[PDB]
Each structure stands twice: as structure tokens, then as C-alpha cells.
Amino acid sequence: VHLTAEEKSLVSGLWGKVNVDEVGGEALGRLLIVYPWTQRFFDSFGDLSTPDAVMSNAKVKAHGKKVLNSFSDGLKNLDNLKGTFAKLSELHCDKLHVDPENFKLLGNVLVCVLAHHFGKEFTPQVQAAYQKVVAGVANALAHKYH
Amino acid sequence: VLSPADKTNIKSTWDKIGGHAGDYGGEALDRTFQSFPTTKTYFPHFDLSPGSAQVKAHGKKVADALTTAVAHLDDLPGALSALSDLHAYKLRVDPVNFKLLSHCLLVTLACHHPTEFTPAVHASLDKFFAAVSTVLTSKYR
Numbered sequence: 001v002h003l004t005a006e007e008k009s010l011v012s013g014l015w016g017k018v019n020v021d022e023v024g025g026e027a028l029g030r031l032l033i034v035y036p037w038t039q040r041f042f043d044s045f046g047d048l049s050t051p052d053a054v055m056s057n058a059k060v061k062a063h064g065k066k067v068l069n070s071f072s073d074g075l076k077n078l079d080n081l082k083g084t085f086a087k088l089s090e091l092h093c094d095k096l097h098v099d100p101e102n103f104k105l106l107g108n109v110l111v112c113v114l115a116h117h118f119g120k121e122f123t124p125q126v127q128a129a130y131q132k133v134v135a136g137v138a139n140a141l142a143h144k145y146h
Numbered sequence: 147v148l149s150p151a152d153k154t155n156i157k158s159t160w161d162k163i164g165g166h167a168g169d170y171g172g173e174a175l176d177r178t179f180q181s182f183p184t185t186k187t188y189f190p191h192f193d194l195s196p197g198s199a200q201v202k203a204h205g206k207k208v209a210d211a212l213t214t215a216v217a218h219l220d221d222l223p224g225a226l227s228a229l230s231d232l233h234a235y236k237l238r239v240d241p242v243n244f245k246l247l248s249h250c251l252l253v254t255l256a257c258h259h260p261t262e263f264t265p266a267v268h269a270s271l272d273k274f275f276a277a278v279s280t281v282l283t284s285k286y287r
């Protein structure tokens with residue numbers, strides 16, 4: 001992560017407007033739906049078998065929230081991502097055993113849910129910066145495998 | 147696979163995109179160049195600045211192609227076999243590239259058409275992009 005001033009202004013500019021109860025929910029939902037294998041890590045979460053089932057399931061809304069808050073945390077600390085995620089990184093790797101390729105993919109669906117939400121304001125400009133931040137996070141999380 | 151729900155979601159979206167395909171193709175290229183710069187690698191003869199006519203012109207082509215496909219969903223391999231040879235034999239393209247453009251093409255659709263970007267559709271297209279990509283990569287496999 002580089003993220004030149006312009007890029008920063010553009011990222012945090014949009015993120016002011018993002019409904020955090022909403023987006024965690026939709027991003028995570030969407031993951032389970034477009035990549036079904038990801039479901040295996042959420043048995044604890046109950047019925048995910050249909051798309052409306054996942055759309056509607058509470059335990060999912062409630063994480064979505066926790067995941068997106070942590071991504072908030074990484075936005076403050078863009079500098080030292082590595083530090084900010086290390087503890088989380090040890091969980092996804094050790095106790096969870098999530099292959100990192102799936103970090104990418106959450107990251108991308110989050111780019112999706114944004115785009116859907118922001119219409120034009122999501123310019124190629126804007127999406128490039130998030131691609132960056134997203135890729136940062138996914139690495140920062142992969143760390144305990146490096 | 148590509149079941150008949152799928153195929154429905156796909157047709158219906160492409161019906162609604164109709165006469166704008168040609169610009170969406172423009173834009174999805176944009177975004178790709180801009181978010182994944184490694185790809186501009188393949189367009190050294192391109193004016194790869196933002197509104198350029200080089201970009202725009204292909205875009206129309208990349209989108210005609212996808213239109214064509216949407217029409218042969220049953221015979222994707224017949225449909226795109228010449229392009230298969232193009233990208234595999236002549237342009238020698240990294241398969242990783244397709245993952246990336248596919249993602250920007252999805253995006254551009256989510257920007258323009260939030261309302262028919264439900265998760266169920268999102269899944270269907272993804273899946274469509276993955277199939278088209280498998281096809282253009284098939285000469286490696």
C-alpha cells in the first residue's frame with residue numbers, strides 16, 4: 001500500500017457515506033452465495049442453503065458488521081496494516097485455516113457491494129484506490145503464512 | 147454448468163443493458179487498466195489514456211463478443227472458438243488476466259444497474275464470466 005494523498009482523500013471521502021450495519025451483511029452474504037465453498041466455515045450460522053436464506057440470516061448481518069468495523073480499523077492505520085491485523089491474522093490461519101485466496105475474494109465482493117451502492121460516484125479513479133486497500137488487507141491477514 | 151435460472155438472469159440483464167454494452171465494454175477496460183496495471187502490458191500500441199478512442203473502440207468489440215455469446219449459451223465453445231485461438235495461440239495471455247477483467251466487467255454492471263444487481267444475478271454472471279474465460283483459456287488445457 002502506497003496510496004498517494006489523492007487516493008487517500010478519495011477512499012476516506014467515500015467511506016464517510018457507507019452504512020456500516022448494511023454493508024458487512026451484504027458483502028459477506030454475497031460471498032457465501034457466489035462462492036459456495038465458503039459456507040463450510042459458517043456451520044455455526046444455521047440455514048444458508050438458499051440465497052434468501054443467507055440474505056435473511058441474522059448471524060450473518062451481525063458478523064458482516066464486525067468484519068466491516070475491522071476494515072474501518074485498517075483505514076485509520078493504513079501505514080502499519082500488518083500490526084493492526086496481526087492478531088486477526090493468527091486466527092484466520094491457525095484456529096481457522098482459511099486459505100488466503102478467499103481473503104481476496106471477500107475483498108473483491110466488497111468492491112462489488114460498494115459499486116452497487118455508490119453508482120457513478122464509484123469512478124475508475126475510486127475503485128483503483130480501493131483495489132489497493134483491499135489488497136493490502138488481504139496480505140496483512142495472509143501474513144501468518146509468510 | 148449453467149442451469150436455466152442462470153441463463154435467464156443473464157439474458158434478462160443483457161436485454162436491459164441493451165444499447166449501452168458498447169460503452170460498458172469501454173469502461174470495464176478502463177477500470178481494469180487502472181486498478182490492475184499489469185494488464186496494460188498487452189496494449190503497448192494503445193493510447194491507454196482515459197477517454198481514448200483506442201480504448202473505446204475495443205470496448206465496443208469486447209462487448210459485441212459477449213453479446214454474441216449471450217446468444218450461444220449452449221455452444222460457447224463454437225461461438226468463441228476463433229477468439230480462443232487468438233488469446234491462447236497468438237496473444238499468449240496469462241489466465242490470471244481474465245479473473246481481473248471479469249471482476250471489472252461485474253463492477254461496471256453493478257455501477258450502472260444496481261437494481262438488477264441482486265445477489266442471485268451477481269452469481270449468475272460471475273458464473274457467465276468464468277465460463278467465457280474458461281473457453282478463451284481452453285487451448286492451454
Ligand code: HEM
Nearest residue numbers: 038041042044066067070071092098102103106107137138
Ligand atoms: C477481508 C477479509 C477478512 C476480514 C477483514 C475478516 C475479519 C474478521 C473478524 C473481525 C473476525 C472476528 C470477529 C470477532 O471479533 O469476534 C473474523 C472471524 C472470522 N472469519 Fe473473517 N475476515 C476476513 C476474511 C475471512 C474469510 C474469507 C473467511 C472465510 C472464508 C473468514 C472466516 C471467518 C470466521 C469463521 C470467523 C469467526 C467465525 C465465528 O466467530 O463463528 N474470514 N474475520
Ligand code: HEM
Nearest residue numbers: 185188189204207208211212229237239243244247278279
Ligand atoms: C471476456 C474476455 C475477453 C473477450 C471477450 C475478448 C474479446 C476480444 C476481442 C473481440 C478482441 C478483438 C479481436 C480483434 O483483434 O479484431 C480481442 C482482442 C484482443 N484481446 Fe481480448 N478479450 C478478452 C479478454 C482479454 C483479456 C484478459 C485480455 C488481455 C488482458 C485481452 C486482450 C486482447 C488483446 C491485446 C487483443 C488484440 C488487441 C488489438 O490489437 O486490437 N482479451 N479480444
